[PDB]
Amino acid sequence: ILPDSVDWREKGCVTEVKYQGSCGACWAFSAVGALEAQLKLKTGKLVSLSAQNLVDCSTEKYGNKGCNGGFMTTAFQYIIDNKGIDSDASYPYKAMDQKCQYDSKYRAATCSKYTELPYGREDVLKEAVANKGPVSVGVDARHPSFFLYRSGVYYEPSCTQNVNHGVLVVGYGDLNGKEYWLVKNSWGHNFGEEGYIRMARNKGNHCGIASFPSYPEIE
Length: 219
Ligand SMILES: CN1CCN(C(=O)Nc2ccc3c(c2)[C@H](NC(=O)c2ccccc2)CCC3)CC1
Hints:
Layout: E1 6-7, H1 26-43, H2 51-57, H3 72-82, E2 85-86, E3 107-109, E4 113-116, H4 122-131, E5 135-139, H5 144-147, E6 165-175, E7 178-184, E8 196-200, E9 214-217
Antiparallel strand pairs: 1-6, 2-3, 4-9, 5-6, 6-7, 7-8
Helix pairs in contact: 1-2, 1-3
The structure holds the ligand CN1CCN(C(=O)Nc2ccc3c(c2)[C@H](NC(=O)c2ccccc2)CCC3)CC1.
């Protein structure tokens, strides 16, 4: 039986909200966020991982385009292939494309595998969030209402399943009769509820939240 609500922030598995600036690195933040939780679960230590490392190093070979976008799944494969990712402190975020500067002496995490969940299945997503940890997802964040979100549960009739923005599901629940997914964004603490947005859950894969979910694992 799955819990009715989950919030991975309560378990100390979620790092501070980051600010991507004018660099489309949402995919990198989503990926590191998922791996940060697994690292805490495995080692007991909560450590911010380097989104910049992904921007600079998980590039053409992974179908990624740095500040012009990328995939969380191929980011995970890069970490696997590379046998590590550096900490945020050692390889800080600059919101621009740079030369790959990965160094294993600053490695803070590894990844052994990742799992892509079946398309559109919010029940499967719920199970993964409850049993595995935070899950990287894409959402349709193109609508003016998304940028202006402040509170409550986000429901936008014009939303689509065409996803364009990488975020991290860190929980789920029910607020005043509205089921939601608890989503960590990377637009700083000014966005939404201290960097978070509650997005409609079990409302027909709203904004494509369950379209392309994935999570990494550590040996
Ligand atoms: C069968 N494939 C189906 C699609 N898929 C995904 O994971 N899609 C997905 C999942 C998440 C995200 C995106 C795509 C978007 N990334 C891009 O727009 C983009 C742009 C430039 C270069 C590379 C990718 C937005 C960020 C979040 C892999 C399996």
